[PDB]
Ligand binder design. Sequence first.
Ligand SMILES: [Mg+2]
Length: 755
Amino acid sequence: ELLVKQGSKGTPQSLGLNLIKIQCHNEAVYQYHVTFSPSVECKSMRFGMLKDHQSVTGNVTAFDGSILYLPVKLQQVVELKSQRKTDDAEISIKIQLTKILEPCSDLCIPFYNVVFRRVMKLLDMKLVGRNFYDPTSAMVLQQHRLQIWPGYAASIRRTDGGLFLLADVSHKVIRNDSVLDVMHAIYQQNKEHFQDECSKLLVGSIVITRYNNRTYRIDDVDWNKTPKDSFVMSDGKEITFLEYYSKNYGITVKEDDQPLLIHRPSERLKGEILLLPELSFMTGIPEKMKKDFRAMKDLTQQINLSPKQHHGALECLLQRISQNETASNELTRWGLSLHKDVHKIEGRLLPMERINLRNTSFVTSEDLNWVKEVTRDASILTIPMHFWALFYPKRAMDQARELVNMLEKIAGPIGMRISPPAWVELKDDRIETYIRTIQSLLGVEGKIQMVVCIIMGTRDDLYGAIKKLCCVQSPVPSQVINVRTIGQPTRLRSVAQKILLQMNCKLGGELWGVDIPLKQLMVIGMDVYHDPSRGMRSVVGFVASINLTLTKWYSRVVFQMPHQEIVDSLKLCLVGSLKKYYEVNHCLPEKIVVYRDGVSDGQLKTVANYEIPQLQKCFEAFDNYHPKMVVFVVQAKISTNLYLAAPDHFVTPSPGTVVDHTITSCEWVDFYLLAHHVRQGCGIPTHYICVLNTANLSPDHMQRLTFKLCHMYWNWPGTIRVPAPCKYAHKLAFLSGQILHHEPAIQLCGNLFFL
RNA sequence: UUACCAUCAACAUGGAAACUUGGCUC
RNA sequence: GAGCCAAGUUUCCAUGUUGAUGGUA
Ligand SMILES: [Mg+2]
């Protein structure tokens, strides 16, 4: 079905885009596999060899290193005898004619992209990582030996509107200090302690090589080897590093006394990739620059481009493309005529939602923030909390009394009935003293409602162990404060406000909600938390709405061992969720809405045709249970940018903007929603892909329901990017994966204990 | 770990095309 | 000859995560 979703609800917004329309007038593409037999690999020297033959291959070539594209229909299988122009050896190349590609094809998308990477190469922009950056517009920090290149993450894609060039104005941190120059500086710093200092600085530090443009993690540094030595290339051939770089890449290496960097490929090839530090350069903010206020503020104020500056950089790119004769010729020879200005459309702005409290219901302002409108009125349900204990190591004791004073001053308009705690001073600041004191306080007394601790500095092990005690071993709701958030009195008041709201959340109270027209709605939020350190011990959190007014969230956690499946884990989580829903609501829901987090574009069909059929196979375990299911793939980090056409320039878009045309994928029912208010930089929306819709949910109530679920998040009094169940599931899975490493207590799963 | 939002640095996973290798295989 | 599966390389991409900076509450 064709995607016609742009309805009348919401006001039209003239949105500029980071999209430039590309009109294609190609008539035939032919794809060949060049088969250089003595194995040249440079991606530019091979381009030079393919440009050496402009007669048989013509002057129009979309070459990329191993795949050639022609419009000329060259004969099947030919051979050529090119010259390497380096150290002398004739180069025997082949031609394959693998495929015939039609004009309007999605397999021409890599060919279009290769043409445009060549076009950016014709603007003298360097290729760093996977993007193109301009060193002419670079800004330099000489005090840190670093530069920022303003360039573009650009890619041609086929959306509903057709062929588009997505160009995001990215910035590349290019460190002028080489790795070899870093070893030179450290060797100047100390002599005997040079190698171990380079070991602790470099192992874990990740470098780039710009001659092939690849990033490698330094797993070790070998000081016993030097480029001069010899290694074996994949044709089983023994050659030195210098000869390999002067032949396969055409680079003469200045210094040959440099050591070697070993990158061990994880999740296994067993090949020690061996790296030269002359062509290896670090990427990232240096250690001395991290604590610099001026340098980081200049870097941040440059990279936090407003939509006016974003569109200005895109217009500069289009002006550079149009003014350069070679780039315009290269685009025109393929029939790819670029647009002079970026694409712009008319999106919709969704209406504001009445946030409801116990007695007051207020329409949200344009800021979409209710920070001060919720600490002046009462929450919907406020559980009174009297018996609790505050744990402090006598150094934040004044800060503890200040926090208690602010809490009892603010519990009035909040609605909490707050009693003074047990002021548990700790004889030591150790984790063992903390845990034994909490356990001894709860061992004798069973009427204690809460345990609130104060942590000296940033201690992740102490917070993790406190949460290990509090929602696994002894199910007591917990709260952890730092001394940096209650020290100064300037922000102490709002900190105490949100802390008391957190106390009300972790006890089963309800903070705020909106009116929802959909009845018996069964909201599911999931976030498959992947572990890159525990041997792929994936954690799937599961947050399920329970009451009809969409305010109680029953939580579940399932762990995935190696060689397991998400199927039975989601089976157990869903049957537990419907068991809780039946035991509370005394009914069964007619509509289950699932918000799956983190699915790539390739795994979308895998999610749609494999996992969700088993999700409806869970449904037969109950008595004639067949409701209507709606599954969402949520993609938060995207590269599409929305602008707002003010009558002078481009500004940040108003929060709550939907785009359901011209950007969406062809094979799915998609839209982009910018729900949150953003004041820094450009407002990235969040991609919302309908994997399945059995409820016949039109995109009017679909977008409105996702926007409404963006409001329900109770750890922030305003709109967040993802919906509230996605963020609840993400925090639950993060706490059960990196902090708990265990399933929680079932009773504490009745409340938002992870907030 | 009082939160949310931006952008940067990196890692990990997955898809499509082409090619190569090794098994089957009609 | 055609087809299936596994692994790898090169192109194009997509998604998540961890840090680090800022902002404001
Ligand atoms: Mg999530």
